[PDB]
Symmetry: C2
C-alpha cells in the first residue's frame, strides 16, 4: 500500500541519472506535445518554451474534455441560487455581479486590478518570451484535470497562441508565487486595452491582431465566474521557468561529469580515482554514477596508455597525489546530481498539479477550498538547485585553474599557450581571470531566495513561496555555468592539441639527439669511441623525462633544461669512464663542445619542420584523441564548429572561439556529441571482485 504517495515518488528515482537524461532528450525532440493534465515533463516544457522554429506543436487530449466541461457547467449551475441550487461557488466576496442578470463584472474587475505590473520601455522589465510560453503550457496542463471550472475553449485559445507563436507580454516582476503576471495572459484573452503580444519576429500586436494571427476560433472571451481565478491562481510562471532551468541543469550535470574525465585524460591523472570500490564503499548513488561515467571515459582512453614513475608518456601520481578537483570530482558532483534529480521530480509533480482554488469537485457536488496556489516546491527546489549549480561551477573553476597552471598540469604550457614564442602568447590567462569572475558571481547567486518572505496582502499571505523569483535566480546561475562550461571545454580541446604537439616534438628531439650522439660520440683513432653506447641511451632518457614545454621554444639555450641535462649526462659518463677518460681520443668530456655545437646546428630546424608537418595535417604521430571515447566532443568543437587552436602567432582571440561553443550550447548542439561519448556504456561500473 502507498497511501501517502511516497512510494510512487521513490520509484521515480530508480535507474541511472544518465538514462533519465537520455529519455529527457528523446522526449524534447518529439514533434507533438500532447497534454492531458497528468504527463507533462520538463522536456516538453523546454521544447515548447523554444522560439526557434523546431515546429513543435501542442495538442489537447479529447479525453479531458468531459471533466473540464463538467466543472465549468457546475459553476454556471451553482450561480442559480435559492430556487435552484445554492448561494454561490466562491470568488472572493459573495454579493455582486456574476452572469445572472448581471454580466461577469467581478471577473472583469479581477483582471483589471491584477494588471499591476510595470514594463517601462525596452525589455529589461518584461518576462522572456520563452518563459511566457513555458507558463502558458503549464497553465493549460494544470487546468485539464477537470477541477478548475473553466471552459475548454479558453484552453484551446491558449494552445493556438502557443502553436502560432503569438506571445502575451508579461511583466518580469510582481509575483510572490503567480497572480499579477498570469493576469496578463487573461487580459489578452479578454482583449483588455493595455494587453500586448509579440509575434514570431518581435512585432508588437494588439489583442485583436493577436487573435487573428493565432487563429482563435472566436472573439474576446467574457469570463464566467471562477474563470478569472482559474486563469490567475496557478504557480505556472515559477514552475514553467523551473522546468526550463532543470532541463539545462540536468544536461550540464552530465557535461560536468564527462569534462571531469576529459580533464583527467589531459592532466595525466591516475585513473584509479574512479575505481568502483571507493565509491561503492560510500553508498551515495550520484557519486557512484559519476565515477562509473568517468571510469567509462578513462577505460577507453588512448591517454590512459600510461608509463609509470620515471615516466616516458603518462604517469600515475604516487608522489605528489592528484589534487582534489581531479581526484574528488565524483564525491563532489554526486550530491549535486542527486539534488538536481530530486528537484526535477518536485517540479514535474508541480506542473501536473491542480494549483487552483477552490477546486470544483463534481463527484461530491461541492467546491473545496485550500492552498494549492502555494508554490513552495518551486522555491525550495530552485534554491537547492542553485546551490548545486554553484558547486558544479566551483569545481569547474578549480579544474580549469589546475589545467592552466604549469606547476599542476603535468607538463602542459603555462596558460595553455599555443604558439612558438611564449613571450608573445599568454594563452588562456584572460579566460582564467574571466573564470574567477564567473565563479564568484555564481557563489553570490547561491544564496537562497525563500528566506526573504514578507507578510503580504494585508497579512493574508503571511507565508508565500517566492518560487518565480527563485527560478529567475537559478536561471541566471545556469547561464553563468554555460559561460564556464564553454570556456573550460575550449580549454580542454586546446590541451588535447598541446598533448599532440608535445608527443610529436618529443619524438623529433629524441630522433635528433640520437643522430647527433651517434655522429659525435664515435670518432676515436679508429672508429669505435669506447664508450658511446650507454651514453646515447641515457641522453635519450633525458629527453623522455624532461617536459618538452620547458625548453622547446629555445631548445639549445644554455639556461634551459635540455642543454643542461644533456651536458650533465655527458659529464656523468665521463666521470665513470676511468682511464679511457685520460686519453684525449677516447674522452667523453672532450666531445661535449662538439656534441653541443652539432645539436645547435640541427635541432631548431628539425623541430620547426616537424611542427610544420603537424600543422599541415601530417604529423609523425597521430592525435591520440581520435582513439578516445571522448573524441565526439573534441570533434564537435574542433571540426564541426570550426573552433580553432589558439595561438599568439595569429590574431584570433579566445573570446572569438568561445562564441562558437556558447552559441552552439545555447541551441542544444552539444547534447548529441556529449551523449555519444557514453553511448557504449552498459550503465554499470567495471568489476572489482
Amino acid at each position: 500500500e502507498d497511501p501517502l504517495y511516497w512510494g510512487i515518488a521513490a520509484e521515480a528515482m530508480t535507474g541511472s541519472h544518465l538514462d533519465e537524461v537520455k529519455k529527457m532528450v528523446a522526449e524534447y525532440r518529439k514533434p507533438v506535445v500532447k497534454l492531458g493534465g497528468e504527463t507533462l515533463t520538463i522536456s516538453q516544457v523546454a521544447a515548447i518554451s523554444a522560439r526557434d522554429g523546431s515546429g513543435v506543436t501542442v495538442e489537447l487530449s479529447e479525453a479531458a474534455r468531459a471533466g473540464v466541461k463538467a466543472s465549468s457547467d457546475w459553476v454556471m449551475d451553482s450561480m442559480n441560487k435559492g430556487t435552484d441550487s445554492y448561494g454561490v461557488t466562491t470568488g472572493f466576496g459573495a454579493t455582486s455581479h456574476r452572469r445572472t442578470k448581471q454580466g461577469g463584472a467581478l471577473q472583469k474587475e479581477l483582471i483589471r486590478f491584477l494588471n499591476a505590473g510595470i514594463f517601462g520601455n525596452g525589455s529589461d522589465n518584461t518576462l522572456p518570451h520563452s518563459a511566457t510560453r513555458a507558463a502558458m503550457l503549464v497553465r493549460i496542463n494544470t487546468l485539464l484535470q477537470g477541477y478548475s471550472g473553466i471552459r475548454f475553449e479558453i484552453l484551446e485559445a491558449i494552445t493556438k497562441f502557443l502553436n502560432q507563436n503569438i506571445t502575451p507580454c508579461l511583466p518580469l516582476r510582481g509575483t510572490i508565487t503567480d497572480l499579477v503576471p498570469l493576469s496578463y495572459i487573461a487580459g489578452l484573452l479578454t482583449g483588455r486595452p493595455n494587453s500586448k503580444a509579440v509575434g514570431p519576429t518581435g512585432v508588437i500586436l494588439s489583442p485583436e491582431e493577436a487573435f487573428k494571427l493565432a487563429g482563435v476560433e472566436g472573439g474576446f472571451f467574457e469570463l464566467q465566474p471562477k474563470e478569472g481565478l482559474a486563469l490567475v491562481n496557478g504557480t505556472a510562471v515559477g514552475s514553467g521557468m523551473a522546468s526550463m532551468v532543470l532541463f539545462e541543469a540536468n544536461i550540464l550535470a552530465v557535461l560536468a561529469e564527462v569534462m571531469s574525465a576529459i580533464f583527467a585524460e589531459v592532466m595525466q591523472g591516475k585513473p584509479e580515482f574512479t575505481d568502483h570500490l571507493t565509491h561503492k564503499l560510500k553508498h551515495h548513488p550520484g557519486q557512484i554514477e559519476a565515477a562509473a561515467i568517468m571510469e567509462h571515459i578513462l577505460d577507453g582512453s588512448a591517454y590512459v596508455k600510461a608509463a609509470q614513475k620515471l615516466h616516458e608518456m603518462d604517469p600515475l601520481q604516487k608522489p605528489k597525489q592528484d589534487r582534489y578537483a581531479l581526484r574528488t570530482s565524483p564525491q563532489w558532483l554526486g550530491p549535486q546530481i542527486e539534488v538536481i534529480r530530486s528537484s526535477t521530480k518536485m517540479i514535474e509533480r508541480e506542473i501536473n498539479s491542480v494549483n487552483d482554488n477552490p477546486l470544483i469537485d463534481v463527484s461530491r457536488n461541492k467546491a473545496i477550498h485550500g492552498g494549492n496556489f502555494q508554490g513552495t516546491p518551486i522555491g525550495v527546489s530552485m534554491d537547492n538547485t542553485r546551490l548545486a549549480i554553484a558547486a558544479i561551477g566551483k569545481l569547474m573553476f578549480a579544474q580549469f585553474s589546475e589545467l592552466v597552471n604549469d606547476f599542476y598540469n603535468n607538463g602542459l604550457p603555462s596558460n595553455l599557450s599555443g604558439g612558438r614564442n611564449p613571450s608573445l602568447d599568454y594563452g588562456f590567462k584572460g579566460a582564467e581571470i574571466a573564470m574567477a569572475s564567473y565563479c564568484s558571481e555564481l557563489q553570490f547567486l547561491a544564496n537562497p531566495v525563500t528566506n526573504h518572505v514578507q507578510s503580504a496582502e494585508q497579512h493574508n499571505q503571511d507565508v508565500n513561496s517566492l518560487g518565480l523569483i527563485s527560478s529567475r535566480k537559478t536561471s541566471e546561475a545556469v547561464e553563468i555555468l554555460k559561460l564556464m562550461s564553454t570556456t573550460f571545454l575550449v580549454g580542454l580541446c586546446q590541451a588535447i592539441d598541446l598533448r599532440h604537439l608535445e608527443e610529436n616534438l618529443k619524438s623529433t628531439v629524441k630522433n635528433t639527439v640520437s643522430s647527433v650522439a651517434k655522429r659525435v660520440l664515435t670518432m676515436g683513432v679508429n672508429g669505435e669511441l669506447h664508450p658511446s653506447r650507454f651514453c646515447e641511451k641515457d641522453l635519450l632518457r633525458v629527453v623522455d623525462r624532461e617536459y618538452i614545454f620547458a625548453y622547446i621554444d629555445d631548445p639549445c639555450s644554455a639556461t634551459y633544461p635540455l642543454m643542461q641535462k644533456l651536458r650533465q649526462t655527458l659529464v656523468e659518463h665521463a666521470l665513470k669512464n676511468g682511464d679511457n677518460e685520460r686519453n684525449l681520443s677516447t674522452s667523453i668530456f672532450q666531445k661535449i663542445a662538439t656534441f653541443e655545437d652539432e645539436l645547435k646546428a640541427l635541432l631548431p630546424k628539425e623541430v620547426e619542420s616537424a611542427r610544420a608537418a603537424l600543422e599541415s595535417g601530417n604529423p609523425a604521430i597521430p592525435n591520440r584523441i581520435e582513439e578516445c571515447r571522448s573524441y565526439p566532443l573534441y570533434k564537435f568543437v574542433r571540426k564541426e564548429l570550426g573552433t580553432e587552436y589558439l595561438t599568439g602567432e595569429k590574431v584570433t582571440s579566445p573570446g572569438e572561439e568561445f562564441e562558437k561553443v556558447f552559441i552552439a550550447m545555447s541551441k542544444g548542439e552539444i547534447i548529441d556529441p556529449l551523449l555519444e561519448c557514453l553511448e557504449s556504456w552498459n550503465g554499470a561500473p567495471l568489476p572489482i571482485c
Copy 2:
C-alpha cells in the same frame, strides 16, 4: 553654521586612525569612568565590560542630577490630573493603576510580560556577563541627560551592580532592537521572583543577595510611571556589544596593517608598494595611512637591506612581481579601516543618545513622542563592520597562504618547517588548513542581518533594526579574526627565525665551499693550479644564489641543487680552460671527484656545528629582527610569552604555541608591543618630491 550636525560628525574623522586607536587605548586604561550622559566612548564601554579585576569604577556626574530629578518630578506631578495638571504622561494605555491611590500596577505588569526570554540550563542561551555589563553602562549613560523621567537613585543602584561586579542574568535572544533583555535588569531592580544575578566568581544570586553584595542603598524599587519604560526602551544591549566589538576591531585593523609589513619583511617583498605617490594618487585616506604605516616598518627594517637581481640577500621582485596579498594590501585594508572608523562614530553617537520614548521636555512642559528606540545605526554599522572584518580575514588568509608556499615565499621552507628532517616536519600544514576553515566561516558571517526584518508586534514594529543580533554576529566574526591573527602572527615569527637560520647556514656553506675549493683546486705539479681563482668565486656565487632550504637537509646529495650546480660550475670552467684542460695536472675536470669527496666529508658536520651554535644562542650572524622596527612584536611573542620555534624534532604542536598568543591577545597584552612598532612614526609618509 552646522544646523544638521554633519559638520561635527565630519570633524570627528579628522586625524589619523592610529592616533584614534592610541587615544582609545589610553582611555581604556583610566581607573575611573565618569558618566555625564554625553562623553561615553567605546573604550570606556570596553573597560567596564571586562570582568578581569582591572579595578575600573564608574562614577555618576552630580551635574546631571538636577535634570534627572526635574523629569522624574515632572512625571509624578503629571499624574495629578484635572484639578492639578493634565490627563497622564503616557505609558501605553491611559486608563489604569499608576501611583495615585493605585500603586504602580502597570509598571509591575510591563516588566512581567517582557520577561519572555528563555535561558534553559547552562550558558548557551544567556547573554555573556561582559555584554550585560556593557549594556548596563550604556543604559545608565543614556538616562543621565534628564529627558527620561526616572529617579537618579535607580541609576545609582545600577552603578553599584557594575562596581561590585554583580551582574543580572539576561537572555541571549528575544530582541529585535532591547525590551525583553533590558526587562531582566528591571526585574533585578524590582526583586522579581525569577530574577537572578551572578557574582564575581560565578555564584548564582537571588535579587536579595545581589542587593546586599552590591551595597544598594535601599530595598527593591517600586517603579513609578515612565520608569519601567525608561529602563526597557533603550538600544543599550545592541550598542553596548557593538562598542566592545569595535574596540577590538579598531585594534585588529592596526595589527593587520603591521602584520602586512612584517609579512613583506619576511617575504622579501619590494618595499616600493608602499611608495606614497601610489597612494596619494588614489586619494583614499585609509589606504594612504595603511601604506604609510607599512612604509614606516619597512624603512626601519634590517631585512629591506636588499641585494637586487642575481641576489645575495633580499631581492626586489621585478620579474614575477609580488602577488596581490602583498602588493595590494594598502588598497585592500584602507576601505575596511574607513568603515570601522565610521562605524565607531555611529556607535559613539548611539551610546550618548536619548533612546527613550516619550521624552520628558521640562522646558516645554510636555512629553515628546517619537522613535529613538529604533536602533538602525547599530544594525547598519554592525553589518558593514562584519563585512570589513571578513575582508581583513580574507587578506590574512591570502598572506598566510603565500607565506607557507615554497613556490611563493622566496626561499622559505614549504610549510615553514623548522627541523633538520623535512620528511618529519610538516610545519604549519595543519594550521594552514585551519586558516581556510576560519576564512570560510568568516565569509559566511559576512552576510547581513538587517535584511531579515519581520513585521512584528501585531504589525506595530513593521520596521525594526535587529541591532543586537547583528552585534552578536560581528562579535563572532571578531573572535575568528583573533584565531586567524594568532595563527598568522606565530607563523610570521617562525618565518623570522627561518630567515635567521637561512643566513647563518648559507654563511657556513660558503665558508666550507671556500676552504675545500682552495685545498682541492690547487695542487698541480708545483702548487698554483692554473686556473683556480675565478673558479672559486663562481662556486661561491652558486651558494649565494641558491636557496639554502632546497638542499641543506642533505647538502651533498647528488639530486639536490648544491652538488649539481657546483659541479656545473666546475664543468663550465673546464670547458673554458683551453689547452691547460688537456694536461692532467692542470685539468679542472680531473678535480671534480676530489672536490666532491672532500666537500662530502666536511660540509655536513660544519652545517651541524653552525646550527647547534645558533640553537645555543651563539649564532655567527645575529638575528636581524633585533634591528627592525617590528622587533617589539617578535620579542613579545618569543621572549615574553615564551612561544617557541616549531620543529618536528620536538613533541610540541603548533596549537600549544598558538594558545599562548591567543590567550594574551584576548587579555589585551598585544596592544603595547603592537603600538611600540610604530612609536617613532611622525604620522606622515616619507617624502616623494
